[model samples]
Target chain A: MVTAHFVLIHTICHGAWIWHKLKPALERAGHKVTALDMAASGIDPRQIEQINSFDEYSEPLLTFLESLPQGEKVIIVGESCAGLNIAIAADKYVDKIAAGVFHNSLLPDTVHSPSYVVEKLLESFPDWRDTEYFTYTNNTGETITTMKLGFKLLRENLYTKCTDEEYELAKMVMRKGSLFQNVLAQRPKFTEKGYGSIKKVYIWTDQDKIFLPDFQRWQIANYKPDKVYQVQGGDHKLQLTKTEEVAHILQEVADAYA
Target chain B: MVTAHFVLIHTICHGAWIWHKLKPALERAGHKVTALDMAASGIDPRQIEQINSFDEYSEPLLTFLESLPQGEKVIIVGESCAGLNIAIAADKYVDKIAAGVFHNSLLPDTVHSPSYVVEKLLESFPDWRDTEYFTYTNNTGETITTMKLGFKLLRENLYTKCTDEEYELAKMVMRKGSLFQNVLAQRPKFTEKGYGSIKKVYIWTDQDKIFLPDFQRWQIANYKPDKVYQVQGGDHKLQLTKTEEVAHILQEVADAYA
Candidate 1:
């Protein structure tokens, strides 16, 4: 196996613990792994009020990349909302990423900045906005959305394929996630010089209930990554339920492209 | 071997990578380990400006402990400046932690507050403030001190025991660390109901140039932990240079106390 540093970004409302099993799996396959908790999620103590922007929310990943040696690079993997994060990293440091893998996540073109991304997401999954998991805050007259996946919704949308132990472990670390109304209103500023320079791969979780297969394919049609890989019969929690399967695909992506 | 959840906190200007070599070692011994990058350090991108308080700086560790199931317990370890971080954790969630191990680190009683800690540290190691590692910032004529280990200092102080490869790898990920003027100015509140309730252990590195044996003993004389363990003939980088050895001591600590 090609030995490369693989940095995995967890989904919104989840911490690095979600990737714990997968990290060891990748390391066992002769690769290095760094799994991170984004702002307000996982163990990150930042309250939603403290996170003023997506960039601020993504500070951990960004700071991590910035600290690397100029020539050193890693394979960046993103799940769910982290798709935007990895894309932002690829945009900012094109030369520092060997490749980026989007697992059941969005591509830059499909992402189309924050508001459009949220609109498309809400439109695609009406149940997401309607669920008890969805919440908001208003300072005076403004409405801002924040989401925390309830156990039932998590069971259906994420942990559908997880074992009872895995499900419980996930519930323990899950926390509130923000929709970033302020961040969404502004453009993420995509360009050919930035995100376009990096090699991108999309691993479609065929059975994903959260970002369904249809949406995954739509992203492929829109963003057109360098490679497309697929996993059979696992929901959004493919990384957890099919640990070796995804780790193998990640190695393949790094070998074939990176 | 006894099994326990192990949470390791990194030192100043470093990330989870510093614990990389030892993580798998502990896992091989059948213990679960979670190594974290503190706020604004490691891969966390929070700028010094973004981190307004110690609560914000140590947010990730605090939140991780907060999210744990009430009855579950984990062994906690801290290195260098993280000694204070883990003690803060033990203070807030005594019941959640099975035991806390200070690896060549300071205990709460030794670390009074930010100013007192720095003053004592500088008094013991005069080179700390005199070296190139420490810097000052003026925000409207208010002098704020920040420190980042330079390559020479990192080599002399931390990587003296590190191999060339280990040394280079560390330099690749090292970032700026806070002197924490704001976090330290206020007294580090101590309570019998908090940090005092948990079991504490100290693992000293006899060859450590940063925290020399004399200081280590001084800390022990004042703090008086449940137990004192020592690793001889290795510098501050014993965690990296002597991976299995440190892991073994950790396992022994967990088995005995956890």
Candidate 2:
């Protein structure tokens, strides 16, 4: 009987569009869903060069949480690198967050550098397979590395289980993304009272090719979460590949946290 | 059996995203398809204020056509105001165009001003329920009128027969669009040797609330196409609502042109 508000955050180079299937599935079960495009990702007008840091890139989510009505808590669901988005949001708006759901995402810990999970992610998934990288100077004049995901990686890895239409949709709207690992490395760790206090759930699949199974296990081992749900056959984009299953898991998150 | 390359162009405020369903349907039938976003629309980096006129806005289509291999001709299909895009493309690269297919779109004649069809469109269907309009000065210091389609108008009018997911997808990706009517009015007419020479096919639906029956009929009466295929029961976005039917018609266009 729980109807929770879900704020979905997409990973680097991806936008709210990735949750197109999952949003409706959650809403079908009476949950309020808000899928946001991180700065410069999806169709958010800002360019990557205009953003300086990870915090700057997370502005849209921060702005969204900032405007939420007081006393109303939401389950923030993040995918891929968006686990960093959840960590960043939970730090500022901890009280407003009931639980943070990590969907095949990087799980950041309070004890380590802000970029620890990202560094580990790169180490585990070394070869990007035709993914192109470029360097651009951000607003702060700091050099930032950005990447445009190659179609080969997108088709063969992330969207392996998704339909051709879904994969084509990704290619149509996908934008350049930055990991901001360097800037994140320089940032302060998440506070214990804020981010660490919130209940966290990790939802993942063994079939993910980009995030890799071993890295996912590493993130879980790195920082233990309240609950873990391992799905069977979806790739990196579980939201698209396993939409209903992800929605069902999200429903459980709302029920438990409620 | 004939294989034809089809270039798909979206209407104002929409990008290549509208053809998500139709593109695959055509591709499954073995036809090559290319969908493009106009300037400031879809995921294109340019903003509405940066664009000066309709000619500049149609750059992607023009650029794509310009890059086609020598002696390669393809069918150019446009929806809504994108018929103007077809006209513009045909005029510049008439030799590269096998046919121009208008999907519930404006029919531009060689005799009138470039903005004639747009003006008639506004006159035929005046009220854009809840649709918000905004104006901005272009790079040339000329005031340009742009519109952010309201969700009510989107749901009730544009996407009436579409699924909730499809409707939500439109809301997520739809950007502001400019008619550039004034600039278009000032521009020259489509030449008889250019846009006028290409074989034109009209594909429309009677259930279209936004374009309206009278307008579609009027367009046909104003400038008769080589063929007219009136679908029985679909809304403005026939691509999503009537994917296979539209594909079947496109296949017919390819066969006829071939």
Candidate 3:
């Protein structure tokens, strides 16, 4: 059994808390895990108003990767919008990443703009179902859009397969999130030598109400991952709903990549 | 089956997240539950340096009690130092409280200074074992002592019986906690008409490492509670260590007090 360091990143609106179940499961198998709260997310003190762009939102992940030992390499596992975070990190610290795993998450391609997957995600699941959207002006005078996910949407969609306690936990800590769609649209595409060269693994579920099966398929078809593990009967939060199954898949990623 | 509303408060360094297990357990038994992060604790978005006194730290609990409907009362359950929070709340909103439950906590008395129990707690258990302490000047220019609980202390003392996941979760979210011992020392005694008149219940375990059996016994002798439920085994965090048992005890509290 190969032991690998796994850095977990949560989606926008969610934080490191989302990996509460999966992190332990991975660790129980003798792998090291680091789950981080993005700027303004989870218990992180920053407010969404202080963050300007997707790059700014991804600062915590980048900072962690920057602090890694010169020869250290680890697997980065992201859920939902965190896929974009993995992409950003791969661009800057590609050498530090052994592999990138997308868990019911968006898959970005090297050919298109940075926001391409985000735009497609919005098109696939348009109805936020009571999720409130608001705008805030950043330090750069850019009007950024953020959304607070509603409980109804959370119960019926994101946490459908999770327990009531897990759902309550989500309601307790979730913060406002932004896709930063506009900023990503203006950003340059990922370079082949950077994000494009890393070993990519896609682990998704068909029962995800928010991401939807079609979007997952589209993403896999758009930019084919080196490996794909399609899980059945779990919601968008497979880590919480199907923790052991997800941990097993992660173990495989660690063993193969490390 | 009796149903009641429960307002859960965590210790100084912990947040509402500490009640993650017990809240759902109580709710599952048909009780309404509200867990709050005191000013800087948990994910309340406030820094400890901005809080002036213990009263300032207890604002969230006070604010929540203030919002209660007239004639509607709740069973306020507090853990560790949060017993001070219950005392503060009982003094201000006695009519709004059905009862105050102390779980391995410091029980404040009406006859002594507000910090008497805290002082005794320190005397009973002086060694913090690798816990790092620091001082910060609050908004009032008074230096307040705070401590970050070390992992060893957390593992061996607080979360001895809890799963690695629960322990990991604690490490992921735990923040700096201040006892506000000095500020609490200068405060006036609690009024009999306010705090003393309310029903009080003490729940503890012999296996607790932090709040030892001697300190717990001293507290019970210091202030005679309306009832006491001594759990046989479990660490300081009975909620996490013995969730079902604590839930049953809480059920009994609701049945009797409601």
Best by DockQ: 2
Q: Which lDDT tens digits does candidate 3 get at residues A97-198?
A: 999999999899999999999999999989999999999998878899999999999999999999877887788777899998988999999889989999
Q: Write the per-residue lDDT of candidate 2 for residues B3-24, one digit (tens) a residue.
A: 6999999999999988888898
Listed for each candidate, the true contacts retained, as a fraction, are: 0.00, 0.69, 0.57
Q: Write the per-residue lDDT of candidate 1 for residues A212-241, one digit (tens) a residue.
A: 767777778877888888888878877877
Q: Which regions in candidate 2 have their CA more than 4 angstroms from the true location?
A: A139-141, B1-3, B139-142
lDDT of 2 by residue, A155-253 (tens): 998898888888888889999999898999999999999899999999999999888888889889889999999999978888888889998999899
Query: How good is model 1 by TM-score?
Result: 0.52
Ten contiguous residues with the weakest lDDT in model 2 chain B = B136-145
What are the clashing pairs of model 3? none
TM-score of each prediction: 0.52, 0.97, 0.97
Better of 1 and 3 by TM-score: 3
lDDT (10s digit) by residue, model 3, range B1-258:
445999999998898888878888987788999999999887888988788889999999999999998988999999999999998889999999999999999999999999998888889889999899999887667789989999999999889998887788888788888998888888899999999999999999989999999999999998999999999888999998888999999888888999
Which sections of candidate 3 miss by over 4 Å?
B1-3
Candidate 1 interface RMSD, angstroms, 1 decimal: 10.4
Task: Assess candidate 2 and give its TM-score to the true structure.
Answer: 0.97
Judge the docking of candidate 1 as incorrect, acceptable, medium or high: incorrect
